Nucleic acid binder design. Structure first.
Lengths: 142, 129, 25, 112, 58, 226
RNA sequence: CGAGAUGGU
RNA sequence: CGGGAAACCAAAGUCUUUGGGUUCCGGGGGGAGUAUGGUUGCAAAGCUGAAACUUAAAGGAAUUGACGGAAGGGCACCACC
RNA sequence: CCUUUAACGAGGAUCCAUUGGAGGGCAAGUCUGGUCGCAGCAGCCGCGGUAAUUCCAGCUCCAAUAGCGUAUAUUAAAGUU
């Protein structure tokens, strides 16, 4: 409640605001740089990696399903990721030991919906898009 | 402690107006208070007033007519220039049609409409409507 | 009194961790 | 008909595990198994009779209905990927399990 | 159930397939906004106050 | 059936006078600040010029030994687009009775609205006369004068009441839980209502008194009436 | 002032 | 009086009609008063004090039910004498 | 290349407009066939266990239009610094 108002108080006002900004959760992680070292993409919107393994993860209650996912190793860091595969039957296009392009799931590093602990999704397989494969416009070259 | 006398004078009038009382007593008196009251009286917001000598700064009794909606103080006496006065009357007044800011200037204590005719800036004291 | 007991549980774990690390070097 | 638990909760529809319980055998992608251990969280350890042990999971349809137990006999669906993991499809009663072995459908390993 | 659980692509593979029944071309640009104006404002039939939307089926 | 007369007969002194003698407007009912308790008085003065709007229908319920028991609550606004607006609420076991009951209370609540100018005084007035505010629950609502031809700068709920009141131009602001439509509507109607009871320099001249309608027509209520 | 834990439909 | 989400408060009032002076200090729930460095102490310990990761609510005041190995009236051989 | 100008150049079944949607927030179907807590959808609240307004498809309708969708940094909304 008691804020100082005197005509020479500008050093107290300016430096107290500067000190109190560090209690905002969004301000702190943008300015310390610990989150930028921790993030498995080094500040990019997308990354390339190689498919290790295909897996099915159990959805959180109150609903019931097996959500189709992949485990991936990124090219530029060699660190490990798991990513969701959108649409009905798309797991049949992916194969193993080949390149995917991966993207964020839409919530800036947090998980989405009933899938436990998955932060990423697949968008391109062997330089062809999953949408162009799913709508029959293109096919995997072999 | 008492850091400012003009803020007491206006808070005391403002509480008496809201209770519907016909008179109020202001203490201590000052040269700044007598000049501020005179600007409200000349525009028709208060009645006439009388000063008591007591050999210790003095006292004032004021007569109230029921027209006053508010009077108030801006505590740091900020400087104003003619180009910036529009922003202050946009912040503090209830309409463009009525109410007044009070300034202190080297030509005297005055109404913010008179400061434009006299082509002068100053420091802010308070307002009424 | 669960919070007072969670405070006691942490103090005895910290006393163990203290003696374990300060023995090493 | 006869209850075999005891409670207020008559609020469901009765189980009727009766009459035309027509005997079910494998298709492609399925195996018969015996339960070895039960874990927490709706999952279990099971051995199928050609000798590959797996970690196994109760399908959402069988929750709080078809109570599985140790040494019980079940029908299991295999995955085309992640071969260590599988899901339960059916339980066989001791009356059905002996009919599977009478049709020669099970190796002489399963207990009844 | 037929085959195993956790089989991908099941319902898109089961679904019976039907060819497109359309023939005629739609309008474009100015001519489509002209058509929408005449259908929504110019000649109109009134109803009871529980007024009815553009795609009412029953 | 056919809409002949005698659907109404008065039950108050004011109703006996309005049906008979030269009470010529609502403004001479407002001047003496009288309560209105017969809905047919406002159909006599404003009538078919009044237009009607359902703001929300809301379910509410109480717990019992057997089950949850549900009622429907309707919020209704009414006005003539030229200086009169009202708001009303009722809760009933069925929606059709709740709406029909809410319209009667929205007619009994009508108030006169003041209008003014932002600039120089050309033509007829078109905005609020000065900066005003109203409260309900935690919700606070505030209205500000605007130059000619801006329209209303507001969310949907306050915009509909200001349009029905007959205000063309307005800037607005709000604070705390506006997601409760009932407190947001009442905070807006409280701000609109205060416009005719703010003391301003054009209202400073001395008041001249007259006799009230019960005093001028004091013999009409006696000689042939009950 | 005896002893009186627990909860698939 | 007036204020408030209300319980309540002559202050917890004189606030969108928002500025008497001035000190300390909060920013969704957890991880956590934890790890690590410094410092004080004979010891127990005190002071200062993170992040990775995780999550759709956690919480305040009040209303109507149901429930109590809570209290007070009254009743029944599908209760007891 | 643009501008200027002779000769050929249009009946629509072509000289054929697309990208996202139709439970709510938020414009637009309590149509018809398939699946059956599976396959899948879903920013958020939520849909699917044999009569699905939400999945997969046909028809109809909505929005912006030579453009429309998604990931990530940042300003407003935030009187949530």
């Amino acid at each position: 409640m008691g804020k100082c108002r005197g005509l020479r108080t500008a050093r107290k006002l300016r430096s107290h605001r500067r000190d109190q900004k560090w209690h905002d959760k969004q301000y702190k992680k943008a300015h310390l740089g610990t989150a930028l070292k921790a993030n498995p993409f080094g500040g990019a919107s997308h990354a390339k990696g190689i498919v290790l393994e295909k897996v099915g993860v159990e959805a959180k209650q109150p609903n019931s399903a097996i959500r189709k996912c992949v485990r991936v190793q990124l090219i530029k860091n060699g660190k490990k990721i798991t990513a969701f595969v959108p649409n009905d039957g798309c797991l049949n296009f992916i194969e193993e030991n080949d390149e995917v392009l991966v993207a964020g799931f839409g919530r800036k590093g947090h998980a989405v919906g009933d899938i436990p602990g998955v932060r990423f999704k697949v968008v391109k397989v062997a330089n062809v898009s999953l949408l162009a494969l799913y709508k029959g416009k293109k096919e995997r070259p072999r | 402690v008492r850091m400012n006398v003009l803020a007491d004078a206006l808070k005391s009038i403002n509480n008496a107006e809201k209770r519907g009382k016909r008179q109020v007593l202001i203490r201590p008196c000052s040269k700044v208070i007598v000049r501020f009251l005179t600007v409200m009286m000349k525009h028709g917001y208060i009645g006439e007033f009388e000063i008591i000598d007591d050999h210790r700064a003095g006292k004032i009794v004021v007569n109230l007519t029921g027209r006053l909606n508010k009077c108030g103080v801006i505590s740091p006496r900020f400087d104003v220039q003619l180009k910036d006065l529009e922003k202050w009357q946009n912040n503090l007044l209830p309409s463009r049609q009525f109410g007044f800011i009070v300034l202190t200037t080297s030509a005297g204590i005055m109404d913010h409409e008179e400061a434009r005719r006299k082509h002068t800036g100053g420091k802010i004291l308070g307002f009424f409507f | 009194m669960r919070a007072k007991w969670r405070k006691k549980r942490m103090r005895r774990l910290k006393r163990k961790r203290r003696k374990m690390r300060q023995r090493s070097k | 008909n006869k209850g075999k638990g005891g409670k207020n909760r008559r609020r469901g529809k009765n189980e009727n595990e009766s009459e035309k319980r027509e005997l079910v055998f494998k298709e492609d992608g399925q195996e018969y198994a015996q339960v070895i251990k039960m874990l927490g969280n709706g999952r279990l350890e099971a051995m199928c009779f050609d000798g590959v042990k797996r970690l196994c999971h109760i399908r959402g349809k069988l929750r709080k209905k078809v109570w599985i137990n140790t040494s019980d006999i079940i029908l299991v669906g295999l995955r085309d990927y992640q071969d260590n993991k599988a899901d339960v499809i059916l339980k066989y009663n001791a009356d059905e399990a002996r009919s599977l072995k009478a049709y020669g459908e099970l190796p002489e390993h399963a207990k009844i | 159930v037929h085959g195993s659980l956790a089989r991908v692509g099941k319902v898109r593979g089961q679904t019976l397939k039907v060819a497109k029944q359309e023939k005629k071309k739609k309008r474009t640009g100015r001519a489509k906004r002209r058509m929408q104006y005449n259908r929504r404002f110019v000649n109109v039939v009134p109803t009871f106050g529980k007024k009815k939307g553009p795609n009412a089926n029953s | 059936g056919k809409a002949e007369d005698k659907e109404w007969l008065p039950v108050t002194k004011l109703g006996r006078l309005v049906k008979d003698v030269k009470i010529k407007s609502l403004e001479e009912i407002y001047l003496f600040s009288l309560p209105i308790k017969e809905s047919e008085i406002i159909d006599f003065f404003l009538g078919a010029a009044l237009k009607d709007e359902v703001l929300k229908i809301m379910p509410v319920q109480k717990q019992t030994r057997a089950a949850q028991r549900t009622r429907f609550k309707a919020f209704v606004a009414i006005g003539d687009y030229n200086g009169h607006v009202g708001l009303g609420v009722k809760c009933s076991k069925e929606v059709a009775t709740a709406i029909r009951g809410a319209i009667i209370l929205a007619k009994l609540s009508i108030v006169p609205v003041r209008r003014g100018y932002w600039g120089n005084k050309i033509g007829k007035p078109h905005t609020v006369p000065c900066k005003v505010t109203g409260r309900c629950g935690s919700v606070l609502v505030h209205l500000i004068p605007a130059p000619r031809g801006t329209g209303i700068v507001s969310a949907p709920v306050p915009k509909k009441l200001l349009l029905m009141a007959g205000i063309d131009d307005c800037y607005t602001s709000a604070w705390s839980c506006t997601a409760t439509l009932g407190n947001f509507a009442k905070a807006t109607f409280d701000a609109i209502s205060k416009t005719y009871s703010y003391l301003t320099p054009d209202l400073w001249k001395e008041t001249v008194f007259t006799k009230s309608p019960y005093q001028e027509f004091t013999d009409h209520l006696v000689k042939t009436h009950t």
